[PDB]
Amino acid sequence: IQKTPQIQVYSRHPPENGKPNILNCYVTQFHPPHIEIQMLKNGKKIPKVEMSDMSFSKDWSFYILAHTEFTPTETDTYACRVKHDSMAEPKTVYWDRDM
Amino acid sequence: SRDHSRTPM
Amino acid sequence: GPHSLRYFVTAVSRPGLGEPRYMEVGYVDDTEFVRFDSDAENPRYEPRARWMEQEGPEYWERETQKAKGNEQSFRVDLRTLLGYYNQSKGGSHTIQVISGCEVGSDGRLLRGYQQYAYDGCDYIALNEDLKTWTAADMAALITKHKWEQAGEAERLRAYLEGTCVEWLRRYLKNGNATLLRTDSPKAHVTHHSRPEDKVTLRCWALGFYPADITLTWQLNGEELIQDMELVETRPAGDGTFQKWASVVVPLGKEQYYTCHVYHQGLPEPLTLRW
Ligand SMILES: *[C@@H]1O[C@H](CO[C@@H]2O[C@@H](C)[C@@H](O)[C@@H](O)[C@@H]2O)[C@@H](O[C@@H]2O[C@H](CO)[C@@H](O)[C@H](O)[C@H]2NC(C)=O)[C@H](O)[C@H]1NC(C)=O
Ligand SMILES: *[C@@H]1O[C@H](CO)[C@@H](O)[C@H](O)[C@H]1NC(C)=O
């Protein structure tokens, strides 16, 4: 029952440079449960990342949220990197401030 | 509060 | 409205790497409130919601002891299922359980449930009558027979109608400021060009609670659920949720499409245009 994870990256509030916000990486619809999730700032791992909201859907696939507080800047780039058996190489999804 | 003392599978 | 208490339990074996990982996560409605993770040093049940500060030290000690006992029961189940399915001891397998109850606005039981899965597929589940079981295959039939002989459904029913309901009522009382609140969604529309003479219109709904919400796109008063693209409602890191829905429209005709947002915190649905 191998299901490839859907990876979504988004902020709590519309991005505004200089103002505190929260960055989220929601990884969903996957199985098996073993998985590696990392949030990155300018390509460097972010230290204090909280894991929360772990649950399963009706088809038993897993869901989990990674999030951290952050203050967006004009130059800073953010992304979420995920490693799971359903994929050969790790997948990196970038935060798109204009989505 | 969680359940407990369940019958094994 | 109705409220629920749900526990998501997972046990995952890892041959050659020690004992299985065991996790329990509890929710009252759409709010995570407690958690247990066997991989944390000094594993104990921990609060995940501010209002759980209202429980005394005895609560945490008792829940931790129960979690440790449950962890051991699932370690045994993982071995038992290898036998039922005639599988090797070198592969990783997963057991999942969803357990809980739902009550109405008056606090009376509406429904109870207990469903199990093995390696991501239905295994056994308690029927709505809270008296009989539904087994998905012959392995689960062995479990069904064991549970019928042991009176497991009666034991479980007592938990669902008693303990589960009583504690859910207490959690709703203690966390009323958080659980009975309504955060209204704030919406806006983004626009994106496409290769061919068309554009993508995306409607965003932010900062709302509870999670249930409806986002739709309309044209001439007709809903476009068929041509709509969206994401499942998702948590935003602070106890609120967000969602978006999009549609592709012809360039120059974006003014004919409207986004409609329906939610508990919107006395009158929102209507947006690009
Ligand atoms: C949320 O409920 C409180 C009542 O407290 C609850 O019951 C306690 C026994 C304990 O279990 C708490 O943790 C529970 O939250 C409401 O507080 C009362 O508010 C009224 C006026 O609004 C005031 O006259 C009372 O003195 C307050 N009770 C006390 C002494 O704390 C609170 O208003 C509720 N919040 C909302 C509006 O959702
Ligand atoms: C279990 O697997 C072995 C090896 O594939 C096979 O020989 C044996 O017959 C199986 N047992 C069952 C369920 O009959």
Side-chain angles (χ1 to χ4, degrees), chain C residues 114-167:
Chain C
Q114 190 89 359
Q115 300 173 298
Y116 298 74
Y118 182 57
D119 287 337
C121 300
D122 288 350
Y123 184 71
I124 194 167
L126 182 68
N127 288 321
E128 297 183 60
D129 60 16
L130 305 188
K131 296 168 179 297
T132 60
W133 310 91
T134 292
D137 59 35
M138 287 186 283
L141 181 54
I142 299 173
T143 296
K144 180 174 184 292
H145 290 328
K146 286 186 179 184
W147 288 3
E148 300 180 323
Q149 291 180 56
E152 171 65 14
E154 295 175 63
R155 186 200 70 69
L156 182 56
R157 183 178 178 186
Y159 164 77
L160 295 171
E161 308 183 322
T163 302
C164 192
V165 167
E166 297 173 4
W167 281 91

Side-chain angles (χ1 to χ4, degrees), chain C residues 54 170 173-178 180-181:
Chain C
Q54 292 176 54
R170 175 182 173 74
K173 176 177 177 293
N174 289 351
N176 70 306
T178 297
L180 302 185
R181 81 180 197 284

